[PDB]
């Protein structure tokens, strides 16, 4: 009884996230197709993603519950098509700002994908099923990225004939998204805890750390293109993304295998791996060798993902399934309020308008200041 909704919910998850041209985005943008100056991408287009993502988060979170979780899933499917239909033919600098906004709906509606299964699957097969619908996404992204650097290198497929394949992939996602059973009970609508010492402190790092992780992911392909232009030398942005994603996936699984009490050795394991993220972000900025810059991304994603798993594990030890959403819903919002404050000052055109050359000395110093205040706070 639990296999039909999950089989079609996993098929939708795999196809939607099997997008080959996620890595080859900025090489595609600032190329001979939609030639855009790197100053028109790092300070006018990309920042809009965090502005629209922040705005369309609470309205979508509340909407997902009132109207049962599926209608929002379809909306994410439609926004996937609109985003890649403008990314194919839409040209200009103003048309790309619209694309970023529609990618806010695509990413902000991801809450209704993971939370849907709770309302249609029996409560016993909730962690079993949740793993199935979460590992398929990682296997889809890793499989897609490997294919991107398999057609661009061995098959010679232009960067345009990856948005066509990406469009077909997401276009088939919105064919299974019409077949999920319609839930009949929501969590809050149709169905003080922060005072705990651990749930607040362990949420502060989750909110702050994930705020910088999203920013680094956004303005990273510009750094690769800056240290080695795509029109002059070969770019392995697909293999690097695939290896980094696999590195994070195995790292998160490792935390779920070792049995160590993350209470006496929890804070130390988060200061130490936060230093590694600060140390490996100066490398991406201080190193001229493009290969070293790839390794800096490889270590950062693998190291950071080893901490979001500890923080998520420590946050969720007493909360119910009915409390994760509004305890992981605030943090995913407070994390964005930090990102918008940082993007406005550091990146936005009206702010400091810092280029990408000097930006990573701030992100690399951002994670070195989330270490002193969570290590100098432990005072006796």
């Amino acid at each position: 009884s639990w296999i039909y909704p999950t089989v079609i919910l996993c098929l939708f998850g795999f196809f939607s996230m099997m997008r080959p041209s996620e890595p080859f985005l900025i090489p595609y943008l600032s190329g001979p197709d939609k030639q855009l100056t790197s100053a028109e991408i790092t300070n006018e287009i990309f920042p809009v993603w965090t502005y629209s993502y922040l705005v369309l988060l609470l309205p979508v979170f509340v909407l997902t519950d009132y109207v049962r979780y599926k209608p929002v899933i379809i909306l994410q499917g439609i926004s996937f098509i609109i985003t890649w239909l403008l990314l194919l033919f839409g040209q200009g600098v103003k048309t790309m700002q619209v694309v970023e906004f529609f990618y806010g709906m695509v990413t902000a509606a991801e809450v209704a994908y993971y939370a849907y299964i709770y309302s249609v699957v029996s409560p016993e097969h909730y962690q079993r099923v949740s793993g199935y619908c979460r590992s398929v996404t990682l296997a889809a992204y890793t499989a897609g990225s490997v294919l991107a650097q398999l057609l661009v290198s061995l098959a010679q497929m232009s960067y345009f004939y990856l948005n066509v394949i990406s469009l077909a992939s997401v276009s088939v996602a919105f064919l299974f998204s019409l077949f999920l059973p319609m839930p009949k009970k929501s969590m809050f609508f149709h169905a003080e805890c922060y005072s705990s010492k651990r749930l607040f402190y362990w949420s502060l790092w989750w909110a702050f750390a994930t705020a910088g992780f999203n920013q680094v992911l956004n303005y990273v392909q510009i750094l690769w293109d800056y240290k080695a232009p795509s029109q002059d030398s070969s770019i392995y942005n697909g293999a690097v993304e695939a290896i980094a994603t696999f590195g994070g996936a195995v790292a998160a699984f490792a935390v779920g295998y070792v049995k160590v009490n993350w209470d006496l050795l929890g804070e130390l394991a988060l200061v130490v791996f936060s230093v590694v993220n600060a140390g490996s972000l100066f490398l991406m900025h201080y190193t001229a060798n493009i290969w070293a810059c790839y390794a800096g991304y490889l270590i950062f994603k693998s190291s950071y993902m080893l901490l979001i798993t500890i923080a998520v594990f420590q946050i969720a030890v007493n909360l119910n399934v009915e409390r994760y959403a509004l305890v992981f819903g605030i943090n995913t919002f407070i994390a964005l309020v930090i990102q918008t404050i940082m993007t406005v000052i550091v990146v936005d055109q009206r702010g400091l308008n810092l280029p990408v050359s000097i930006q990573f000395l701030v992100y690399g110093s951002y994670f070195a200041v989330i270490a002193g205040i969570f290590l100098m706070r432990s005072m006796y």
Partner: nanobody
Framework: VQLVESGGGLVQPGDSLRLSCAAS????????MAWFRQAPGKEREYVAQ????????YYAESVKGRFTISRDNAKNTVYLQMISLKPEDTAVYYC????????????????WGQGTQVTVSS
């Protein structure tokens, strides 16, 4: 926008040139203007760019350091200043005015100029 180019001519090597582009007709919305170039028996080649709202520029790697592009929003014209010319720069230059708005198309540059003849020789 009806871009008109002028200022072409044959110059001995090491002689600069200034090329203007009297953009006119719908100049309220021209969010860029990037000169191009088409050498004899070749294809159009990027040569410069200048934003209209601000002044951000982006020159081609080969031509950077001698080619200076400056907007003149008062009169709408866009000037390309070139120094240290050589007989390998003989080509024809074209403007390309990115009008603006939400559009679907094949090329970012909506409207194009006619073309000015530059013939470096001696």
């Amino acid at each position: 926008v009806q871009l008109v180019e002028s200022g072409g001519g044959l110059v001995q090597p090491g002689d600069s040139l200034r090329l203007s582009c009297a953009a006119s007709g719908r100049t309220f919305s021209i969010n860029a203007m990037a000169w191009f170039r088409q050498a004899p028996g070749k294809e159009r080649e990027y040569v410069a760019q200048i934003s209209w709202t601000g002044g951000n520029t982006y020159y081609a790697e080969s031509v950077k350091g001698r080619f200076t592009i400056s907007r003149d929003n008062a009169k709408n014209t866009v000037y390309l200043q070139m120094i240290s010319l050589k007989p390998e720069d003989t080509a024809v230059y074209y403007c390309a005015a990115d009008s603006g708005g939400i559009r679907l198309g094949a090329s970012r540059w909506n409207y194009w100029g006619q073309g000015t003849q530059v013939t470096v020789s001696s």
